[PDB]
Amino acid sequence: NIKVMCRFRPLNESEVNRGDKYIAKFQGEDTVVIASKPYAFDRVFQSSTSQEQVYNDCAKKIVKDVLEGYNGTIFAYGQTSSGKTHTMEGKLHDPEGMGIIPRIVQDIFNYIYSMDENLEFHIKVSYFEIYLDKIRDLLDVSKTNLSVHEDKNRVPYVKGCTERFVCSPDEVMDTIDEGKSNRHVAVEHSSRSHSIFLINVKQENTQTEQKLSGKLYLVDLAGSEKVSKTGAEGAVLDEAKNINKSLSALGNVISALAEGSTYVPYRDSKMTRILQDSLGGNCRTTIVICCSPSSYNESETKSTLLFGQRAK
Amino acid sequence: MREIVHIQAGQCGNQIGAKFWEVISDEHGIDPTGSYHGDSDLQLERINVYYNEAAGNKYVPRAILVDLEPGTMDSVRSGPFGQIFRPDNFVFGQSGAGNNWAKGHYTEGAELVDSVLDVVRKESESCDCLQGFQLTHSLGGGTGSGMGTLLISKIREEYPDRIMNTFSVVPSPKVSDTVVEPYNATLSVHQLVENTDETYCIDNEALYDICFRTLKLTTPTYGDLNHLVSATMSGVTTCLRFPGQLNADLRKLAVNMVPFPRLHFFMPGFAPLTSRGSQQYRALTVPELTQQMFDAKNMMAACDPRHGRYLTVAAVFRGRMSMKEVDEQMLNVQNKNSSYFVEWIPNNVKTAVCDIPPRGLKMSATFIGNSTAIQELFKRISEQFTAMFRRKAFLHWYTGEGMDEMEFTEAESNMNDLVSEYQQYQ
Amino acid sequence: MRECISIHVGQAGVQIGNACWELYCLEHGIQPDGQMPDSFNTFFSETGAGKHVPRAVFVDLEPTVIDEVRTGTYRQLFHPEQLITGKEDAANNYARGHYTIGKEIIDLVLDRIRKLADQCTGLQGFLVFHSFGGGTGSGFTSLLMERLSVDYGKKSKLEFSIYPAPQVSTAVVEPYNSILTTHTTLEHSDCAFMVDNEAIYDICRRNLDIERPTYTNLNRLISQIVSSITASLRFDGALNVDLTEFQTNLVPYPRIHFPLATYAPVISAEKAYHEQLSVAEITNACFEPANQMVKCDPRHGKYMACCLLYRGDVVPKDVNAAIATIKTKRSIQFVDWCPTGFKVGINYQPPTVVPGGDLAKVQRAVCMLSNTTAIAEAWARLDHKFDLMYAKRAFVHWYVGEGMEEGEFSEAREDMAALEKDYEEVGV
Ligand SMILES: CC(=O)O[C@H]1C(=O)[C@@]2(C)[C@H]([C@H](OC(=O)c3ccccc3)[C@]3(O)C[C@H](OC(=O)[C@H](O)[C@@H](NC(=O)c4ccccc4)c4ccccc4)C(C)=C1C3(C)C)[C@]1(OC(C)=O)CO[C@@H]1C[C@@H]2O
Ligand SMILES: Nc1nc2c(ncn2[C@@H]2O[C@H](COP(=O)(O)OP(=O)(O)OP(=O)(O)O)[C@@H](O)[C@H]2O)c(=O)[nH]1
Ligand SMILES: Nc1nc2c(ncn2[C@@H]2O[C@H](COP(=O)(O)OP(=O)(O)O)[C@@H](O)[C@H]2O)c(=O)[nH]1
Ligand SMILES: Nc1ncnc2c1ncn2[C@@H]1O[C@H](COP(=O)(O)OP(=O)(O)O)[C@@H](O)[C@H]1O
Ligand SMILES: [Mg+2]
């Protein structure tokens, strides 16, 4: 089923001296009210919540399902300086402040270290991004216009995407860094393109001769931008248009899945087309949206909350 | 100022385009030699939409003709209006397509697409402000389908924010001339559903039926069918070159008529249509045109509108008429036939009125409909494709040019998804 | 001196302006070439050789109708730099008229407006004509209004808009554009007048005895209303009322500034005779529910303030008698907190008849501008249409494809709900 999680960040030192004020109000643990307008979700986190609680409550079940041959997907949507990188990556080695991806790889590797000796595991990693509705490869700059096809079982995939094996969390972190070192970033560190990261785990029992394949998807959604209030010209305007259209299409797909409609518009955009296997049916997906409670950022916070609410 | 680049691919496309250019030149008052011999200023006021200026008061069409055989080229060049095209815009090969989608789209079309794109680019850089591209082709053939699809893909890559409308002739159930038509139709729809902004579906069976019943023709030929198609094509974009009380652009029609990105398949129409020796007994007013347009025996697609509901209907009137009459007619049409229109969309009908009627008419109207009845056409095509694909019949010709069965499977899945989309809102 | 600036944006605005300027030229005796063979300074300015130039700006993103103006019978009247034209129209898209195509001629129109305002000493306000539903008339009007509010600020701005009809309609995406533009018009305007085509069609059918009306008749009627409003500034007479007095007598609370207009007597030549057409008869006919130019019967609501603008041969004693007769009635209900809700204005200049027109030469005419609580029904109908179309999110990808987010629709819907709530709560 579809689950939406909302996280709030504290007022840092660099902005407390300007006299900003809180806007968010909490009731229980699932309702956050701004300007006397409720916004119900599945779980709302407060400032004091550490990363361990977020990992245990948002991603643990999805990680568990992958290791049994199922599929999972984790999104990430928010504006700049809203907590996205802190809740996704953070410090890469601190055992208390590390993000979600380090805990994901730690859990996915601590199981391979403890399961008998008659099972053989392989790990595959891919890293491709969507920019101007054209799939590029972050792990191979040579490829720039990859395509999407369907195999015999009409399960979509990406053709020609680079796929390399790994053997330890260090390799996964290093390839993550190398992939991120080529993503489109505007002039503080605002991403202008959606990013998709695949962690494929497949097992084959040597005795039982049964094969199980599992896919985990990590998606970094770019931020929607209101063009009228900025003054975008040239390439920035095209990027904003593409980002808004893609986010609207993804919201439409998620709403259609949630409402139980007979037809789901899976073929309206590239991103929903690729994730067609790991979105509906017996697939568990969770969305994390990061918000800022300062009065300086009320409009973007409202937009993020509305995008989260669109799913339902 | 809102120019249009015209491309014709294949024999059917070339002949339809020749008839279309004859009709347009008659409307604007241009002699076959390329001179101007009109009688009004409005003819020359917006002539840059379809024509280019030349030395000594001469006008050359912005048309590009592409084919893999030199037969249609020198058949057109010898016609009544063959002296009008620019000789450098003819591009052709020597080896025919042979009714092979794979050949035209992969082997012999890839050795000719560069020159066609070069002439397209040269033609499109002399325009002040582009509006879109027009393409005329047939889905059931080899050169037309594959070549037009390749050109569409290349142009959509080069120009990603321009209108693309194609007037494609669709295979008919009870009229056929090729044995491998369903393969071509499916492989062409698989790309038209993705790389087009609004496509107009036409079939020969409906045109033959119109000629037999409404026009009371005895021995119709291809000229009449091409003539009807050209008439509706000219009526589609009449607001880009003439004044009027209400003006509708191509992008305006796309915005008003397309609710969701995939559903952009329309069935055209025209009115009035009568027979010689039967015009003195009919009065010509707005109600008569409205009644004729919404008739099941006037559409140019072999689909029954009664077996479904409309999503959006666009009616472009030409002539002098009152706006209250048009509004009341378009309202009572929906009120009387509430079961034939989608309930959750209010005001399914859009009205555009221009005050320059076609020569020899007092009033004319073109009908553009987006109904769910178009699903049965794809149903028949997919059924024939499934019948001929289980046994892999006539398949080694396509796999002999560099294709795979996965292309056929993906095309069939895409067409099935389109059919599922259209049925959902019924 | 007392001057006003007219801005016509969109096709409907341009055609309304054509009718209005024909009427003004007829009234003040100015030929189409600008030569006449001090009651005209309000709408024109001299040049030193006898030519008169209107204080108007024509703006459209499509070159069709403006080109009709440049080659028509009034080609020698307008300054060629006033008629401003772009390349591609909005295609019924709010975002295209707002930003995507708007940021290509907005500086030009702002410079022209500044040039016209720098040449006028006693500016009174602005007069904007546009239509709801279209891309240009809903998006480009918002940008221009915002820029004018930032720049000028304290100057009054009056709007004359076309509202979507209940059943008769032309486009399919009209509710979206109307909702967005009515969200925009509450923050920057000062007195917005709305009309719909269906009521005017009915008025033409019953009164004028014409069965196939077109846009020209509607434009002529709207031009007559505007001329009746501006006659007080232009001409002289007993009890003259200007714009600020209108606003201080008509708008009780800051956001309740949405009146509906009515004109009388709209009669034909055949019925011009055989009828008395005294002051009392004309005054009574203006309160009928079948003569309003908006599809809403005033019986299901209460009036707050109405201003009567008589022009022609009128004596105040007759006005007072007619007012007493109207007050003694029962079907017309006023609010309890307004013991006096009538503002009377009289002018000595009778209405002018345009050649080739459907109206008759009458010795007197009235124009009543009243704001009642019965104006929320049209808003309710349009909001119901909007939510019915927005539940499935149809035609939305076109709007988000120009950089417009999905929160604007909900915000505008909330604003319209708040406006309707305010009207209902102030009615009681
Ligand atoms: C005496 C009189 O009024 O004659 C009419 C006529 O009888 C009818 C039957 C015409 C006639 O049309 C046909 O018979 C016909 C033949 C082949 C294909 C399609 C139609 C007519 O030939 C066609 C002709 O159409 C035009 O003149 C339009 O401008 C039309 N022109 C052409 O198609 C055209 C033909 C040859 C050379 C150049 C142009 C047009 C329509 C749409 C957009 C542009 C142009 C008209 C009104 C007539 C005749 C002459 C009998 C009809 O057709 C049209 C297109 O108007 C058939 O039903 C209509 C109703 C007309 O009343
Ligand atoms: N009174 C009157 N109304 C008109 C006229 N033309 C259009 N309308 C109304 O205006 C609405 C359509 O908007 P338009 O003004 O034509 O569109 P636009 O403002 O030019 O915007 P775009 O054409 O989309 O760029 C409909 O409700 C029409 O009924 C006219 O000439 N007179
Ligand atoms: N209206 C019309 N249809 C045609 C004409 N010629 C062929 N067709 C149709 O086009 C289809 C055949 O494709 P065709 O264009 O001849 O093959 P190609 O030359 O390889 O593109 C069949 O459905 C024919 O009925 C023509 O001149 N006019
Ligand atoms: N939940 C949180 N609790 C405490 N501090 C946070 C939290 N989220 C973000 N921060 C602080 O915000 C700072 C920068 O945020 P960052 O993740 O870089 O946002 P972005 O990547 O969008 O710029 C970090 O130094 C971190 O200390
Ligand atoms: Mg327009």
Author numbering:
A (entry chain K): 8 to 194, 199 to 323
B (entry chain B): 1 to 44, 47 to 360, 369 to 436
C (entry chain A): 1 to 37, 47 to 437
Extract from the study:
Kinesin-1 (also known as conventional kinesin) is an essential ATP-driven molecular motor of the kinesin superfamily capable of processive movement as stepping dimers toward the (+)-end of polarized microtubules (MTs). To limit wasteful ATP hydrolysis and futile runs, cargo-less Kif5 adopts a compacted autoinhibited conformation that involves an interaction between the motor domain and the unstructured C-terminal tail centered on its IAK (isoleucine-alanine-lysine) SLiM31 (hereafter just IAK motif). Using engineered stalkless chimeric constructs of human Kif5, we present here MT-bound cryo-EM structures that explain key aspects of kinesin-1’s mechanochemical cycle and autoinhibition.
To explore this using cryo-EM, we designed a stalkless ‘bonsai’ kinesin-1 chimera, dubbed Kif5bMoNeIAK (Motor-Neck-IAK motif), which fuses the N-terminus of human Kif5b (motor domain up to the end of CC1) to its C-terminal IAK motif via a flexible linker. Irrespective of the nucleotide state, they were present either in a two-headed state with motors zipped by the autoinhibitory tail or in a one-headed state with some tail density still visible associated with the MT-bound motor. Whilst for ADP-Kif5bMoNeIAK only the IAK tripeptide (KPI in the opposite direction) could be modeled, for AMPPNP-Kif5bMoNeIAK the ordered region is longer (AQIAKP or AKPIRP). To assess the structural impact of the tail on the ADP-bound conformation, we superimposed the one-headed ADP-bound Kif5bMoNeIAK model onto ADP-bound Kif5bMoNeXXX. The models are almost identical in all regions (RMSD = 0.3 Å), demonstrating that tail association has little effect on the ADP-bound structure of the MT-bound head. Despite the presence of the tail, the MT-bound head of Kif5bMoNeIAK adopts the same apo-like ADP-bound and Mg2+-less conformation seen in Kif5bMoNeXXX, with an extended helix α4 and ordered loop 11 in the MT-binding subdomain and an unfurled partially disordered loop 9. Furthermore, the bonding network between loop 9’s R190, β7’s D231 and helix α2a’s K91 described for Kif5bMoNeXXX is also present in the MT-associated head of one- and two-headed states of Kif5bMoNeIAK. In contrast, in the presence of ADP, the MT-associated head of Kif5bMoNeIAK clearly exhibited a disordered (and undocked) neck linker and shortened helix α6 in both single- and two-headed states. As the two-headed class had lower occupancy in the presence of ADP compared to AMPPNP, it is likely that the stabilization of a docked neck linker and CC1 supports a two-headed complex including a more ordered tail.
